[PDB]
Design a protein around this ligand. Structure first.
Ligand SMILES: [Cu+2]
Ligand SMILES: [Cu+2]
Ligand SMILES: [Cu+2]
Length: 158
């Protein structure tokens, strides 16, 4: 009985474009919370996410929409997020906004530096399907993700 994680939110990507929960529709999305000034933890996770994406694209032909939402809207402005994610996978898009907008998002995912231990996988309907924690390595994470994308049905049982 998975919790009611996720929900409507209104942010902007590291380029200023509007991005809301509607942007999650039509694809599998993997979301990660953290901040550019986050110590050792976040950098390792984003590196791990990069291995998953690479193996997923080249081995299973699956492409995800990787999103990095900041929790420190005070310092992580768009420009700052682009700088920060230049050391990581190009596919990753950082999202940010005002205190209120960022506050809402973090809340909808029940995220209240050591809480950035989960990746949230969302289906083409924008629904929560699984939370991958630190116990998944570069191998087991790929496995789990692959069975979710392969067993997903439009929930419209056409
Ligand atoms: Cu946070
Ligand atoms: Cu947060
Ligand atoms: Cu927060």
């Amino acid at each position: 009985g998975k919790p009611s994680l996720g929900g409507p939110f209104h942010l902007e990507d590291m380029y200023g474009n509007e991005f809301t929960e509607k942007n999650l529709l039509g694809k599998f999305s993997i979301i990660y919370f953290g901040f550019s000034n986050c110590p050792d933890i976040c950098p390792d996770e984003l590196d791990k996410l990069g291995l998953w994406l690479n193996t997923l694209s080249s081995k299973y032909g699956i492409t995800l929409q990787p999103l990095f939402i900041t929790c420190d809207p005070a310092r992580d402005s768009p420009a700052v997020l682009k700088e920060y994610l230049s050391d990581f996978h190009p596919s990753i898009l950082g999202l940010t906004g005002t205190f209120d907008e960022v506050k809402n998002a973090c809340k909808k995912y029940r995220v209240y530096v050591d809480h950035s231990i989960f990746f949230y996988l969302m289906d083409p309907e924008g629904q929560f399907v699984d939370a991958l924690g630190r116990n998944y390595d570069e191998k087991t994470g790929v496995d789990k993700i692959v069975e979710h994308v392969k067993s997903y049905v439009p929930a419209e049982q056409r």
